[PDB]
Amino acid sequence: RQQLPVQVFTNDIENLNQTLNQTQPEAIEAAVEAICRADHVIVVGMGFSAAVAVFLGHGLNSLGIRTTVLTEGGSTLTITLANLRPTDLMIGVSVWRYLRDTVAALAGAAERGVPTMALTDSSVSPPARIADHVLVAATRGVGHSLSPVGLIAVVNLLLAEIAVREPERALAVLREVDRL
Amino acid sequence: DRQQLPVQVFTNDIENLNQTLNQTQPEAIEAAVEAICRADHVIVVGMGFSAAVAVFLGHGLNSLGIRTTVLTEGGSTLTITLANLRPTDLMIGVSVWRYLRDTVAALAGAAERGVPTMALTDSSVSPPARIADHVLVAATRGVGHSLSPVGLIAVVNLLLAEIAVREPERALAVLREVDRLYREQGM
Amino acid sequence: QQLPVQVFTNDIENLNQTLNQTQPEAIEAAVEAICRADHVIVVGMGFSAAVAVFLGHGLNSLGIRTTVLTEGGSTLTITLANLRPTDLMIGVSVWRYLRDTVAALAGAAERGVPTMALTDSSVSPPARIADHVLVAATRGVGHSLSPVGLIAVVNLLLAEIAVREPERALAVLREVDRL
Amino acid sequence: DRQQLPVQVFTNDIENLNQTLNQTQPEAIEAAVEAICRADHVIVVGMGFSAAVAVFLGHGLNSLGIRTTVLTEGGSTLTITLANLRPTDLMIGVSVWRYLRDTVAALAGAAERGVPTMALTDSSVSPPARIADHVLVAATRGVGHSLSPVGLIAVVNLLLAEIAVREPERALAVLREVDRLYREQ
Structure with missing residues (x-):
């Protein structure tokens, strides 16, 4: 039990390593271009994944990318799916066990020709x-x-890539939050 | 004594409906409905007592095919929302006595940025x-x-009724899509 | 042109019909259950979400600690797993009856937790x-649909609790001002 | 230039884990876990950047059988929560620079009323x-x-792992129940 702090932190370091290992420059660049080209971003993450979706929407909105975060499924998510536009981007955060409403949101968006992105735990997972x-x-x-540290680190990378691409937009939002 | 409370509560709400109907102006309803329909995006803000009314109005607008964000809390989320407003947005604030500052600040931030604003409120001369x-x-x-929200809720019922008659094909497309999403993806 | 009169007349009729269906015995038993609970959970989704939000706000503002859930799934399943016999589960559920609210009521009833439904029929699934x-x-x-009748029922519960426990209601206002 | 961002980002988060591990004191984790277990109810407050950490902590606690309310915005909802506090509650505030006042006021409000308080923060001398x-x-x-919430998330990971080892029976019952309700629905 006295080893529990070192075990926990060592484990989160391996999570960051496996995540860094599987990070592809092409996949990051294409995901960042999709985020920037969208007229509106929808992020869906439920259960364990809700905190990652909340972090990603806060970060996008903070950078001037208008984003809706949905951390529960049901009727609200169904009506969002019913109102999707070709200029939207649907981002699902979905890891094992894959909560069906998130997977269904990606499947519904994909069917309607809406760009989709999955932040997940396996390159062959349902999302x-x-x-x-x-x-x-x-x-x-x-x-x-589970530990969301690897998912959070991917979000950190996405936010850093957007901020370098569009510094003026991000600085402008920052000027308004600095005032509060 | 308190056996009279059901008559008192229900009669108070009937009187609220009669007074609200007496204060409703056809020109103002028409201008409000046109503003909602012309917006590319609608933001509805209501806090505390008003949060329920903001939730109902956003549910109604989204069901009719008008993309709507509902905010029932202020602070940093509202600041960031204001920072990201567009001239094609519509900001709707639901604000009644006591006028919680952040809903009024949401209307003020929108009006300062040249974004259309609408207040669902309790007096024609209130701060919002x-x-x-x-x-x-x-x-x-x-x-x-x-306080009772029945009056505010009836005004939202009227806005939803007015939009559904103007744009019934847009409302039906949502229903048809919701049915499709249950059939194809189990939603 | 006649839509304002139709909409407001319809809501007056919803209030009159709700008043006609209100049983003094049932209101009394429901207020006693809310006041007896250590914690209250209010569940309402879709159309019913606004009613759950209003009822949660009103109970908290009277000093009755209440959680509002307006979506099902994860948070709801974990809520059911953590339910205590001293809780009260209130479900706001009307036609078309979304499954998750009905499931929250069933889950609470199976666990021997007091339940209450704010609904549109005496024989509805909730x-x-x-x-x-x-x-x-x-x-x-x-x-x-119109939530006016459900909202009036909540107005009536709040009004009944406020008369029974006016000092607890005042204390909440006193704390809010102090804070 | 921009080609170095994955290495910069991921190294930055490893350094955050290392620096957080070094600042983690066993007596403070032990007292934190005892206070979370002793509470009859836990309230987690975290706004803006901190909201995601609050949401993760509330989920983890609830998932282990610790009944927890999560508030990610201030205003009237937080103010009414503060007005209804019990001596048996535990107030947890996740608050880092720029310290949004509503979370710091939630902690100040609870402490004034003699309600146990805990801060997940970025400095031992910060306002919370x-x-x-x-x-x-x-x-x-x-x-x-x-900013990066990785260090704060790892502290939460440590709290949840410590709770799970203290009360394994309660945690498994919630996991079974949760799996059984997910199977059902």
């Missing part, structure tokens, strides 16, 4: 098989509770 | 009414310190 | 499960 | 650290203006 853009992270926990 | 381009007023009187 | 049922009229002029 | 009974610090440095 990976559907989505146009796939980013993979390790999620291993020392016990049953 | 004085800021917004479009104003709709409802009676909110409760039998006690808990 | 009414058949719940210990306490309160029925409201929901007819809208269109295809889109 | 100076108010709270329990303080856990993590490194939050990002490669740019967007």
